[PDB]
Amino acid sequence: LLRHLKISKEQITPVVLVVGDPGRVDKIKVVCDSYVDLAYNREYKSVECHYKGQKFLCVSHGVGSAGCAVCFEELCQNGAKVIIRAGSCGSLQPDLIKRGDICICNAAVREDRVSHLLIHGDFPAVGDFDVYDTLNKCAQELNVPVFNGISVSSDMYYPNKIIPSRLEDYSKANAAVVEMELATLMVIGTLRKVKTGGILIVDGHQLENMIKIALGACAKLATKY
């Protein structure tokens, strides 16, 4: 049994949908054709999801890079082949990417520590193209407009007035979106030979759509294994 997930290696599917809020696993499992509740340990909720004739895990990783890293490391080290993060984000391009908009990200700014404790800072946090294009191909089938871009993955939610935040610098660098976990998934994916991707709803109905794309992509990708 896995230390934090508390599910077995035998319960891990090639494809896994990951989200931050365990309450969100509960909302996702409902719209699937059927589900099997697996475990709920600390912030980590596991449910097996049956959708469009496919079987995939939906696991919650909690808030922040270090606690999600424990979830991803346990997934990646025990059989996951594809991990897609369905999550929530903020806009770094207001007057373009507005509240409600969905964004499918190829890359992420590494504003964590853990990824850096795994590999030198120069290394890219980058998603898998197969996964990215699949996510993109699902949105199109569903006629749901999505943005594409770089995500700033920052360990800081609440800034101080001492150290100037780099969010404006990253915005100017055309980073689209800001969240907390993507770069970690992405580096861990690359290191562990797991294909990753990320789909985010802009926060600070469209959720229905977002989840459909996420569930759509997971099913499409699950077919391969």
From Swiss-Prot:
Disruption phenotype: Severe growth defect in host erythrocytes which is rescued by the addition of exogenous purines. Loss of purine nucleoside phosphorylase activity. Changing residue 63 to F: 40-fold decrease in catalytic efficiency with inosine as substrate. Loss of catalytic activity towards 5'-methylthioinosine. Changing residue 157 to A: 680-fold decrease in catalytic efficiency with inosine as substrate. 200-fold decrease in catalytic efficiency with 5'-methylthioinosine as substrate. Changing residue 63 to I: No effect on catalytic activity towards inosine or 5'-methylthioinosine. 20-fold decrease in catalytic efficiency with 5'-methylthioinosine as substrate and no effect on catalytic activity towards inosine. It catalyses: inosine + phosphate = alpha-D-ribose 1-phosphate + hypoxanthine; guanosine + phosphate = alpha-D-ribose 1-phosphate + guanine; 2'-deoxyguanosine + phosphate = 2-deoxy-alpha-D-ribose 1-phosphate + guanine; 2'-deoxyinosine + phosphate = 2-deoxy-alpha-D-ribose 1-phosphate + hypoxanthine. CDD domains: UP_EcUdp-like. SUPFAM superfamilies: Purine and uridine phosphorylases. One of its GO terms (molecular function) is S-methyl-5-thioadenosine phosphorylase activity. Changing residue 203 to A: 200-fold decrease in catalytic efficiency with inosine as substrate. Loss of catalytic activity towards 5'-methylthioinosine. Changing residue 44 to A: 790-fold decrease in catalytic efficiency for inosine as substrate. 4000-fold decrease in catalytic efficiency for 5'-methylthioinosine as substrate. Gene3D superfamilies: Nucleoside phosphorylase domain (3.40.50.1580). Pathway: Purine metabolism; purine nucleoside salvage. The keyword Ubl conjugation does not apply. It is an enzyme of class 2 (transferase). As part of the purine salvage pathway, catalyzes the phosphorolytic breakdown of the N-glycosidic bond in the beta-(deoxy)ribonucleoside molecules, with the formation of the corresponding free purine bases and pentose-1-phosphate. Preferentially acts on inosine and guanosine, and to a lesser extent on 2'-deoxyguanosine and guanosine. Also catalyzes the phosphorylation of S-methyl-5'-thioinosine (MTI) to hypoxanthine; MTI is produced by adenosine deaminase (ADA)-mediated breakdown of S-methyl-5'-thioadenosine (MTA), a major by-product of polyamine biosynthesis. Belongs to the PNP/MTAP phosphorylase family. This is Purine nucleoside phosphorylase. It comes from Plasmodium falciparum (isolate 3D7).
